Structures are given as structure tokens and as C-alpha cells.
Amino acid sequence: ECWSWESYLEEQKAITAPVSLFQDSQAVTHNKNGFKLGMKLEGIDPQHPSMYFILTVAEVCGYRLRLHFDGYSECHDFWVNANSPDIHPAGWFEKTGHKLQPPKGYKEEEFSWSQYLRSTRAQAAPKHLFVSQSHSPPPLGFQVGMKLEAVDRMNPSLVCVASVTDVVDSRFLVHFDNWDDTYDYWCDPSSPYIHPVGWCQKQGKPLTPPQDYPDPDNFCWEKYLEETGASAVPTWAFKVRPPHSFLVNMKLEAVDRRNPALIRVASVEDVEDHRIKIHFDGWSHGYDFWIDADHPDIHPAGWCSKTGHPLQPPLGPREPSSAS
């Protein structure tokens, strides 16, 4: 009497989102997850994405892992997939010229991997697990210091003056000039959230200048590039990603945003060019959420079963928090 997709589709007269609609990295199920509890590594802080910390594997589940910030509270723990580009092997920050935010109780120059592994009686995750370790070709045409226009992903009505502030493998970090780094996000040349200098003017859209720019209303890119000596990212570097082809009512699997340990049976509730709205089957519409179609936490039906992760079935009828 166990839950299966095949049976559910028959019961519901429903269809799945084809595997072809997903990025290969969202769909891949045949890779081994070689990470083990206690292994140490390096990674970005997902809520402060310019910063790198020492992390420990706190839990393994299928193709996913829960990462802990060494020395800090378990409240900051977070989940990634084993093919995440946001994690790197011990030694990566030194090799690539990045800075470390050290474990609690350590000053930066008090941290050394060999001593730290001795102190903690631990092992580093081996290098042959990581898709990202500064071996891949850089994103063509995007260099640190170049400027561009970018959507504030947290306030997506705004297109804003931005800079490239880091480049790692095929991606780069978008930073909003004179604002906090917690508005930064990682990107590739095909992102629908970035544009060349001058795009807002060509589109008739208002451009948000750097925080507190002396005389905001009169902001001028030509002047700003002269002031900074910076170049614009060349127009040729920006590439179009095609709109996704998910359709309303297609079914798939999605990580629960409120309890990221869990993955649930999901439906496409609404669509935009580059985002989908997820409804969790059986649950209140109050939990529906928009997500980018390329987000790493949506997957084709079957992904949990094939990777060894539990799948939460639809919430039962008339339970608390349910929908008809």
C-alpha cells in the first residue's frame, strides 16, 4: 500500500513535468553522495553570499546534506545537494585568494587546516566530491570590478546599479554598490536578473542608483564610470536564457521552504517566464510560493526515490493546514 508516483497519477488523472523541462543538475539521480557525517569543508554563507566559512556535514539524506557552521549555533544549519556549486574542498580559499570567516573563537590568522583537523580530530571531505574548485573556465566577459544593472531579487520591482565582486568557476557575484552584501547573489551570464549598463534607459524603466548617491535624481552612468574608472560588462557577455516550459498542474517534487529537511509532492500552481509557483498537494494555498525554474530545490517526480531521500505524500483531507 506504499505511495508511488505511478499510482498517484492514475488516481488524480494527472501528469508530471517531463525530465526535459529541468536542468541536468536538478534531474541527475545516478551520482553517488560520498559526503559523510563529520567531514569538513568550505562554503558560502547562503544568507551572506560574499562570505566563506568552515562547514561540517551534520546530516546526510539521499543526495542532500545538512551543513553546520563550525563553532556557531545549529540554528544556522542549512541543506544543499551534493552537486552544489556553493561548497568547496579544504584549501580552496587559500588556493583561489579568497578570505575565510573563521570558526567561532578563532581569529582569521589563527586558522590553519592542518592544525584545525588535529584539534577537531576530523577529516576534510575529499576533493573528488566537489563540482566547484576553481578548475572550470570563468564566465566569459564578466570580471571583478565591471558594472551592470541588476534586479534586487529581494525587491524585484527594482533594477539597480551593480558590480561584479567575485568570480568562481562558471559564476559571478552581483553586488549592489554602496549597499549591504546580504543583498548580493551568485549568477551566470544567462541570468534573467541582469542587464547591461544602459538597459533601464533603453527600456524606459527607472534605475535605482547606489545607496545615498550624492544627488540621486541626476545619476548618470557615464559620470559614475569615470568617477570609478570602472568598465561596463560588455553587452556580448549577456546571454538569453529561454523561458521555461512548465505548465500549470504539472507535478514534481520540491523542498519544503519552512522545514528544508523535507521534500514533498508538488504541483505547478502558476507560471511566469522564469519562475513557477509551487503548491504542495493537500496543503493550504497559504504555503504556495514562487521559485525560479532553475532553483536547485525543485526536481522531477522520482528524484527522491532514485536518490534515497524520503518523499512526503500529500496532506490528508480535512487535516489542519489542508486544502480541498
UniProtKB/Swiss-Prot annotation:
Keywords for this protein:
Chromatin regulator, Metal-binding, Nucleus, Phosphoprotein, Repeat, Repressor, Transcription, Transcription regulation, Ubl conjugation, Zinc, Zinc-finger
Site feature location: Mediates recognition of monomethylated and dimethylated peptides: 152
Annotated phenotype, changing residue 152 to A: Abolishes binding to monomethylated and dimethylated peptides
One example of the protein's molecular function in GO is:
methylated histone binding
Q: What effect is documented for mutating residue 155 to Q?
A: Strongly impairs binding to monomethylated and dimethylated peptides. Abolishes binding to p53/TP53 monomethylated at 'Lys-382'
Tell me which Gene Ontology terms the entry assigns under biological process: chromatin organization; constitutive heterochromatin formation; hemopoiesis; heterochromatin formation; negative regulation of DNA-templated transcription; regulation of cell cycle; regulation of megakaryocyte differentiation; regulation of mitotic nuclear division
Q: In which tissues is it expressed?
A: Widely expressed. Expression is reduced in colorectal cancer cell line SW480 and promyelocytic leukemia cell line HL-60.
- Residues under site feature: Positioned at the entrance of MBT 2 and is required for recognition of monomethylated and dimethylated peptides: 155
The coiled-coil regions, if any, are none
The record's region (Interaction with monomethylated and dimethylated peptides) falls at: 176-183
**What is any one of the record's Gene Ontology cellular component terms?**
nucleoplasm
Task: Cite the repeat ranges for MBT.
Answer: 3-103, 111-210, 219-314
| Mod. after translation | Ubiquitinated in a VCP/p97-dependent way following DNA damage, leading to its removal from DNA damage sites, promoting accessibility of H4K20me2 mark for DNA repair protein TP53BP1, which is then recruited to DNA damage sites.
Q: Which parts of this chain are annotated as the region Disordered?
A: 309-324
Q: What is the effect of changing residue 152 to N?
A: Strongly impairs binding to monomethylated and dimethylated peptides. Abolishes binding to p53/TP53 monomethylated at 'Lys-382'
**Subunit comment:** Homodimer. Interacts with RB1/RB (when monomethylated at 'Lys-860'). Interacts with p53/TP53 (when monomethylated at 'Lys-382'). Interacts with CBX3, ETV6, KMT5A and VCP/p97.
Q: What's the further remark here?
A: The L3MBTL1 locus is imprinted. Paternal inherited gene is expressed, while the maternal inherited gene is silenced.
UniProt remark on domains: The MBT repeat 2 specifically recognizes and binds monomethylated and dimethylated proteins. In contrast, it does not bind trimethylated proteins. The MBT repeat 1 does not bind methylated peptides but inserts a proline ring in a Pro-Ser-Ser/Thr sequence context.
Q: What does this protein do?
A: Polycomb group (PcG) protein that specifically recognizes and binds mono- and dimethyllysine residues on target proteins, thereby acting as a 'reader' of a network of post-translational modifications. PcG proteins maintain the transcriptionally repressive state of genes: acts as a chromatin compaction factor by recognizing and binding mono- and dimethylated histone H1b/H1-4 at 'Lys-26' (H1bK26me1 and H1bK26me2) and histone H4 at 'Lys-20' (H4K20me1 and H4K20me2), leading to condense chromatin and repress transcription.
Name of this protein = Lethal(3)malignant brain tumor-like protein 1
Species assigned in the record: Homo sapiens (Human)
- Lineage of origin: Eukaryota, Metazoa, Chordata, Craniata, Vertebrata
Name of the encoding gene: L3MBTL1
Segment of the intact protein contained? 272 to 595 of 840
